[model samples]
Target: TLGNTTSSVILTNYMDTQYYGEIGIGTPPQTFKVVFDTGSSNVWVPSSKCSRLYTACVYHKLFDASDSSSYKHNGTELTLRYSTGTVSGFLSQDIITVGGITVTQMFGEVTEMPALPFMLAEFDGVVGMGFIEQAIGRVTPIFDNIISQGVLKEDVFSFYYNRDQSLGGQIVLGGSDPQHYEGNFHYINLIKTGVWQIQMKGVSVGSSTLLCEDGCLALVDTGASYISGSTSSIEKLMEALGAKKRLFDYVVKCNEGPTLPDISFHLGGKEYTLTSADYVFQESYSSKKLCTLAIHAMDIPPPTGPTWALGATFIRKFYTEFDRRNNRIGFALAR
Candidate 1:
């Protein structure tokens, strides 16, 4: 068995999720739930010193420098821009612990942020797991440090986003759980360019191949709730899935769920299937029996950047591996 440490993460919903893991920070060990994002680099938590505060900081735990004997402020201001909002903070070094593993790393101590958005967040902040080269502000991510610090059996990690209510989802750093996956794992070389990106052969709804006729780039973005492709490609997929687009979402009659076909993607020439149960979200607001497609339409990124995201929808059905040792990504059917 490979050496490892695992942290249980919660799946907020069957379709989109705000998956989080608990980690202890500082001496007395104030624990907080944080999202493990594979799309970016850097770990940050709201600081007690953050000014311009609002109800956002009311419910979450904050890192208090005064309370920790080992806390050191690096006096470097850091700013991170996200699709949600901007977070500005100062760099601080401290011993942060996760899955019972500890490391001294520089972390962002957020001092200013928007209120309404943070108020609804189930997690305190994000712990990025991307390559250090992809990090903004040159912050070394926790996962990378864990490997460099020699705390595990292997320089690898894996994610199991269990089906809704299974309560078995987890992220294992330095190892993987064979019990969580079925069959053999399919390996794909990650484009050394950074971020968890790989070459995709194509995507198809049922038997109708939609896009990536030649090839495309796919980003494994854990921070995203749903999948997204180029606008034209997504529109084609929605039509094939019998979905009616309403603004940014595709809605379909709930009765159609049983007949909907699996959407397939060929990665490294291996076929990974996403059944209707995986693509159709389990939420409805109207009295009518209707469900929404878990995919969204976005502009395709140029060849230089990641084009689409294989978000929670795809992840829930797959056990994914991030192998730093081989510089590759692996996937297997969820058990």
Candidate 2:
């Protein structure tokens, strides 16, 4: 219960949905609860046929592709794969509901395929956690439909989470009240150097040797994540900053997270400092006495990939306000 989930998700995050009892349309509409995800944008729902636990839904309204009230049909088919498997469906617009609140005239991609065995236990269908970066069309985000329809007050939202916790969190729509912001929130440009990307200038230690030649872009992924360095710059940055060794073929600083540094960045013309807790997840002492980045290294992970995806815990320390309407992100200090 650390974060709050919003009742309405703007259609800007989606493509189309059946509207006014219409069927097939541009992008279909679907409503889903706010869940934790650091991925591509495309919100999904458990199309009534799902038999899951946390994401089970009855699909109170379904836009039959044949119905023409508000649906568009193309002679093409589509398929999308999740952490689970592939879901194929047609594209259209429809109305979506969440706990009695309805956002009409939003577009989304909907599928009525059979539920996966693994998904039957995990979630109904996942929302496209990422936006713009993964969109077929930049403006077509998981929540873009709502924004276009002018249902949401603003094109911003916020999240709070703890990896060690349970469900029921918050995803606020429009804008967070001023009280939620404690200090100046530094805004950074989102650049994807590798995959799960973020904007970084450089790495340093308490005003010592600046380890990186230039700031590296990073992946702010907390789902299916540990953490990794997308390039040699950040890989070495973590090692040098931690003052640890490059042992065990890749023995990284895995024992515990670094002591959150008083880091600042020059966003636009403003200087901002990140809080200490903003850098460490589960900010607890090392259960294993030896602090290393292995717990947070991609090299140490059995599988391999590019991009330095920061997990949810690191992201939580700061208030991450997503600006969908304008394509800008705000990073603020946490209380």
Candidate 3:
């Protein structure tokens, strides 16, 4: 029921660990698709009636100010924030249904989210989906709460996205092929520090290595972004690898596609290796792969500690599973 929390793949944290869903499907037939993301944790979407925009403006649902139930619109006043600026729109919630599977209380904002920063355009609101029950924990995801309340099932959930990654992916609850995570394994303790950060000791690049103290932190998010570094440490580390810095914000494009700068981390004595593609996104429009995220271009405002963060671009290709019950996160390389 997000106004800006659009989509169906609802992640529980900005650093994606667990996936959530009411039914893993959005507005039945009329809507294209929706993902419930916990990464950013806000709900919103486009309207069936948006003026002065484009020709083909189709939306999943419209949050009309005139509508009553849980809605109080003071005009279409809304602005959602991205990695860069804030998006504009109004906010409200209403009873929503997913795949005719079930319908529960949902919320959303009616407006436009920031586009240019992460290169996103079109779309209405976010259906902020998360673990539900918050009564017992310091921070509880909305989806999990619903499950605990007997609204949905915990064991019957699975998110399936093949090699065909278009604009988005799909989430399925109840049943899925168990062959998702079938690669080498590395175990790490879930950091208890931030809402989006995990504890990583180091990153390995090919045969090279960099300690977590060297900077760069792992913020596992799957909402909508690739991996990037914002500290001089990543830049220096890459430079140490013989790659020139193409952009000052730790963004570099080597003569041969930034080369496979493998990175690894040590947690609980397990070493995890991340490939070059895991750290890069090749834009089709541009002849080169442009970095969507960097150590931030500046610090996360203040709180100076380390820099660099990894997003879903690196996490998606490899099937990821976050076991909250065990306090661990696992990634298995997928095809």
Tens digits of lDDT, candidate 3, 1-335: 11212123432322232222332213232232344443444545555445435322332344443444434333435455545455554544443555333434334343443234313333334444333321112223334433444433332333444432132334534223345556564545556523345666666656656545543456555543445555565565566555445443444443344564666655446665666555444333343654432222323333323434555555565555544445455555654
By lDDT rank, best first, the candidates go 1, 3, 2
lDDT tens string, model 2, 13-82?
1101100111112234432333345455554433332233422234233334443445543423445554
Candidate order (TM-score): 1, 3, 2
Model 1 agreement with the true structure over 215-254: per-residue lDDT tens digits: 8888887777678887777878878777888865888887
Worst 10 residues of 1 by lDDT: 7-16
Q: By the lDDT metric, which is better: model 1 or model 2?
A: 1
Model 2, poorest ten-residue lDDT window? 13-22
Candidate 2 global lDDT? 0.42
Query: Highest lDDT among the candidates is held by which one?
Result: 1
Global lDDT of each candidate: 0.78, 0.42, 0.43
Candidate number with the higher TM-score (1 or 3): 1
lDDT of 3: 0.43
Q: List runs of model 2 lying over 4 Å from the truth.
A: 1-38, 45-76, 81-94, 98-101, 104-122, 129-133, 136-139, 162-168, 189-198, 209-212, 218-228, 231-234, 241-307
Measured against the true structure, the TM-scores of the candidates, in listed sequence, are: 0.90, 0.56, 0.64
